[PDB]
Structures are given as structure tokens and as C-alpha cells.
Amino acid sequence: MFKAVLFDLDGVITDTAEYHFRAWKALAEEIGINGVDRQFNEQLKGVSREDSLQKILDLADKKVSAEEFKELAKRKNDNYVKMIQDVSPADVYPGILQLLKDLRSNKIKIALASASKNGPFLLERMNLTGYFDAIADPAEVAASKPAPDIFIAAAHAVGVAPSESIGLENSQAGIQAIKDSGALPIGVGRPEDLGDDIVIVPDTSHYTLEFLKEVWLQK
Ligand SMILES: O=P(O)(O)O[C@@H]1O[C@H](CO)[C@@H](O)[C@H](O)[C@H]1O
Ligand code: NA
């Protein structure tokens, strides 16, 4: 049986990927870059703040100073942080609270493997901190998603091998990170976005302990 579940946050625990998209699109349009639509935004899911900004600046082969890069990342983060102040337990996605309670009852470890520095604040907003055995700090890894380091760190933080873990993701970069860690990925979203080669569910209500156990058995 698996011994840990390694959760991404945005698009898995709650709909904060929507707010990252809206904030990055507003920033891009302020500097004259119009290509951040929903399709392009699939490349901005899962990756660090700095890698997200650089992908946007690439779109128009745009060159800003080092000082302006720092200011733009800060502007977008300050906006996003204002948008999430009213997030509450009512915003936890269907099935997720029940899954956390069932994993804990069965002595299965729970860890966060998010590249977002806003992860701890959001788990507090949703009254979920007490369910998590560890939060992997994204600033402590040498290489961010799609590198596997953050999933390896999350498993190690709860005393379990990546090969004895499941990872839950809504991002292209994060599915690749799980694959290269040795853990088993289960995605949530559209196969048109995330691929036809791994197990994908259409919404989070499908993330039951009973479904996870069957996927493990059949891997
Ligand atoms: O700005 P933080 O909240 O630190 O990082 C965020 O991380 C998200 C999840 O990978 C990503 O989709 C965002 O573009 C990025 O700004
Ligand atoms: Na709270």
C-alpha cells in the first residue's frame, strides 16, 4: 500500500489557479503583452513566480532591466495576495476535506509539494494546516518544477520514499515532476491539457481513498 499522498495546492485543493491566471494576464497587458490567454496559461501552472514572469517576457522576446523584473514580479504578487484575502473553508474543492480525514484515519502521511510561496497562508485561510504532516519549502530546493526536487523533499519530510507515494496535480510541469520523482501521478483536469498516458479524473470529487488504493493496486 502507499504510505504518503503529496498534494499540489493551486487547482487541486482550491481554485487559486484562476486567480494566478487573472493576475498574470493583467500584468502582461500593462506592459503591452497580449498573448496570456487560457491556453498559454497552461505553461504558467505549477512553475515558480520567476519562471512564470520569464515565460511571459519571452512571448514577445521582450527585454526589461533586472530592476524592472523585480518590480513586475512584486506588482503581480501584491495583486494576487489582495485577491486571496477572503478565501475561506467554503472554497475547499469537493472531496478534498473528506480525503484528508480518511488518509489521517488510515495513518497515511500528508504533505504539500507546491512551488507557491503563498501555500502556508492559503492552508491557514482554509483551516487545513492541522491535516498536513509537512509543507515542503519551495525556496529550499535547488531546482523548481518541472524538476522532481519538491516532490522528493515532500516525501522525505514525512519519512517515506517517493516510490511509496502518490502525487496529485492539475499542471503539466507538476505531472512531469511527479514522473521524475518515482511517485505515482494522478491528475485532475482535461486529458487535452495533461495527457492520455497517466490516470486523470475530471474533478476532485473523484479523489477518494478507495479510488487511490485501486490505482495503486493496478499500477
Ligand atoms: O507567486 P507564488 O504564489 O510564489 O508562485 C505561483 O506558483 C503557482 C503554482 O506553481 C504558479 O502557477 C504562479 O504562476 C506563481 O506566481
Ligand atoms: Na484560518
Question: 106 C-alpha vs ligand 1 centroid, how far in Å?
Answer: 32
Question: 125 C-alpha vs ligand 2 centroid, how far in Å?
Answer: 4
Catalytic annotation on 137? no
CA distance 129 to 38: 30
Among the atoms of ligand 1, which is closest to the Cα of residue 52?
Answer: 14
Among the atoms of ligand 1, which is closest to the Cα of residue 118?
Answer: 3
The structure's method of determination equals: X-ray
Catalytic annotation on 58? no
CA distance 101 to 53: 37
Resolution (A): 1.1
Would you tell me the crossing angle of helices 66-83 and 16-30 to the nearest 10 degrees?
140
* Ligand 1 touching residue 43 (CB < 6 A): no
Range of the domain at 60: 16-82
CA distance 133 to 109: 6
Rounded (5°) CA angle 110-111-114: 145
Q: Are 171 and 145 in contact (CB under 8 A)?
A: yes
CATH number at residue 51: 1.10.150.240
